[PDB]
Amino acid sequence: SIQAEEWYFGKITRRESERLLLNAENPRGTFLVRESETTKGAYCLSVSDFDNAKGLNVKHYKIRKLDSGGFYITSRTQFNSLQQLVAYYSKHADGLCHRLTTVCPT
Numbered sequence: 877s878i879q880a881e882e883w884y885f886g887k888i889t890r891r892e893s894e895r896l897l898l899n900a901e902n903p904r905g906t907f908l909v910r911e912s913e914t915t916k917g918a919y920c921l922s923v924s925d926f927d928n929a930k931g932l933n934v935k936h937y938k939i940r941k942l943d944s945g946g947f948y949i950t951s952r953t954q955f956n957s958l959q960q961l962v963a964y965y966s967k968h969a970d971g972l973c974h975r976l977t978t979v980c981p982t
């Protein structure tokens with residue numbers, strides 16, 4: 877759980893996530909989950925996007941974790957695990973820049 881997850885990069889900075897995601901070869905939705913730099917207990921979901929307006933770019937979303945157990949970006953849409961959250965957002969874009977597609981290559 878989490879650390880076993882290949883999309884879990886653990887303790888890497890926001891800048892490092894952008895370095896990895898800003899690769900021209902990455903299609904929209906390339907992603908990774910990492911620790912937040914300053915929000916304790918929260919993780920960050922970093923996602924690549926692309927459009928003709930900005931071109932290749934990166935968005936960061938905070939994944940909150942309750943002691944009650946749930947994981948969520950928006951409190952209205954919660955999951956029993958980080959894994960289920962990733963699987964859901966791989967199917968639904970909802971408010972994200974793109975549905976999660978491919979785990980970010982190192």
Ligand SMILES: O=P(O)(O)[C@H](O)c1cccc2ccccc12
Nearest residue numbers: 889890911912913914915920936
């Ligand atoms: O700096 P990170 O790691 O991206 C971090 O989780 C973060 C992202 C976006 C806004 C933030 C605001 C406050 C504290 C941390 C924040």
